Amino acid sequence: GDQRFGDLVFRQLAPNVWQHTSYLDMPGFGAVASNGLIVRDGGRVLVVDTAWTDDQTAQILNWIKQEINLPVALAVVTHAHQDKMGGMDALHAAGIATYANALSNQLAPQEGMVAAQHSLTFAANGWVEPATAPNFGPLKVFYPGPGHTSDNITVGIDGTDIAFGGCLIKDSKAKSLGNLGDADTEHYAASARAFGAAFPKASMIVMSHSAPDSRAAITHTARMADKLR
Amino acid sequence: XXLXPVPE
Ligand SMILES: [Zn+2]
Ligand SMILES: [Zn+2]
Ligand SMILES: [Zn+2]
């Protein structure tokens, strides 16, 4: 059920939800997938994460225009790395309102990323302050705590079985958490478990670098992270 | 080069 559109892949996950996949080919390492979400919410589209590049992100907007033909009201990006925020200029050139964690926007210049137009803030329990995320419709934004990065956020789609862990969550078969160089190894396990507790009805876990998985992706990520403490 | 899971 995948649709290819130039160098991009779209997979419908629900009546109103698609996963977008873009690829960066590294010589001698191969193509690396990064996944985000496209959500149809009545008469508008909401995007979660850019593609690796502006050109790839422009192609996402072209696919949306062709397959959904509704305006993109906003995009939320889940941390200040290239796979999630590489395409901010393409969103801005299209007049799309962009949202990120205030900390993502603060880190963005140091990470070589373009900051979102708007900053999200979070309660002590991890839930987004609603006034910083106006008209997010079914997007439920949760800051689980530091893990993959200090700024990583997650998004549940209300009225679906879908929760997006971004780069925080690894698939249930992963051999490791990958590169722990700039990770928060102390808090990673608790952040993974908080994401799980925030979206208890999510049975489909979408993540940046694997195919959609079961809640076993959350437990496996947390148990791998338990061995870092 | 900060290419997500590739640290370069
Ligand atoms: Zn960094
Ligand atoms: Zn990533
Ligand atoms: Zn990252």
From TrEMBL, chain A:
Sites where Cysteine sulfenic acid (-SOH) occurs are at 167
Enzyme class label: hydrolase
Q: Which GO terms fall under biological process for this protein? A: antibiotic catabolic process
The keyword Oxidoreductase appears for this protein = no
Q: Which coenzymes or cofactors are required?
A: Zn(2+)
- What main location does UniProt list? periplasm
Where found, per UniProt?
Answer: Periplasm
Give the Gene Ontology MF terms in alphabetical order: hydrolase activity; metal ion binding
Binding-site positions, Ca(2+): 54, 89
Q: Where along the chain is Zn(2+) 2 bound?
A: 83, 167, 209
Residue numbers binding Zn(2+) 1: 79, 81, 83, 148
Entry EC number(s): 3.5.2.6
Query: Which residue ranges does the record assign to the Metallo-beta-lactamase domain?
Result: 33-209
Q: Which family does it belong to?
A: Belongs to the metallo-beta-lactamase superfamily. Class-B beta-lactamase family.
Quote the subunit structure annotation. Monomer.
Name the record gives this protein: beta-lactamase
Q: Which organism is it from?
A: Klebsiella pneumoniae
Per the UniProt record, the lineage of the source organism begins with: Bacteria, Pseudomonadati, Pseudomonadota, Gammaproteobacteria, Enterobacterales
**Parent sequence residues shown:** 42 to 270 of 270
